[PDB]
Amino acid sequence: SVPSQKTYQGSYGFRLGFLHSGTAKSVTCTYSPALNKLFCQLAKTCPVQLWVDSTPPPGTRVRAMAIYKQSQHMTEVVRRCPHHERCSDSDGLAPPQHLIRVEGNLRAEYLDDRNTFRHSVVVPSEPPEVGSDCTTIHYNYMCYSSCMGGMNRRPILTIITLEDSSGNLLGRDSFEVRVCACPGRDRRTEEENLRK
């Protein structure tokens, strides 16, 4: 009733990477290594790098799923709030209830789990292009952390899993997410709070 969040590189050395976007007031997405936390604006591009030490088999996939970080909320499905699930901002593929979308991948699939009712979005794993050392998935988060009746100011984690063609686990990584109006200021504030 709760997905695992244990980091697991697995046989292929799977792990995530993030750009170094800084903390200017204007930044739309920024990652804090010290907090393992992504700060982003609503429905803005969040580039997440996928790194492996060796290429997994054809048919490998990469799944993203959100869970609440606090234990007393972890059994609750993370979903869009009653406002945003009705605002008709569909990309033609993502169900309007799903918090996490993938941008610009026509092979993305959206799952409503028939047993847990949790949402996820999955894409094929592909090796890096010629001259590149990793691949990047562009995610969008479609509600604010503060949305009433949805996340309701509760922190969430995103769990990224590398899966074989049957859905079996090959690798796992994760990061906290805050969706907010001013990611640069909020990253600076929370990093200062950690230091203090």
Q: Which residues bind Zn ion (CB under 5 A)?
A: 81, 84, 143, 147, 150
Structure tokens that stand for 110 in this block = 């959206």
Task: Say how far residue 193 (Cα) sits from the centre of its chain.
Answer: 24
Residue that the structure tokens 């997905």 belong to = 3
Relative to beta strand 37-40, strand 109-112 is unpaired
**Least distance from C-beta 80 to Zn ion, angstroms?**
5
CB of 78 to Zn ion, least distance (A): 11
Nearer to Zn ion, 37 or 84 (CB): 84
DSSP character at residue 6: -
Q: How far is the CB of 126 from Zn ion (least distance, A)?
A: 31
Beta carbons within 10 angstroms of residue 82's beta carbon: 11
Using Cβ positions, the residue closest to Zn ion within the complex turns out to be 147
For residue 143, the minimal CB distance to Zn ion (Å) is: 3
Q: Which residues are annotated as a binding site for Zn(2+)?
A: 81, 84, 143, 147
- Give DSSP secondary structure letters for 121-187: EEEE--PPPTT-S-EEEEEEE-S-TT-TTTTTT--EEEEEEEE-TTS-EEEEEEEEEEE-S-HHHHH
Q: Name which of 86 and 107 has its Cβ closer to Zn ion.
A: 86
Question: Which of helix, strand or coil describes residue 38?
Answer: strand
Which residue lies nearer to Zn ion by CB, 163 or 186?
Answer: 186
> For Zn ion, which is the closer residue by CB, 84 or 98?
84
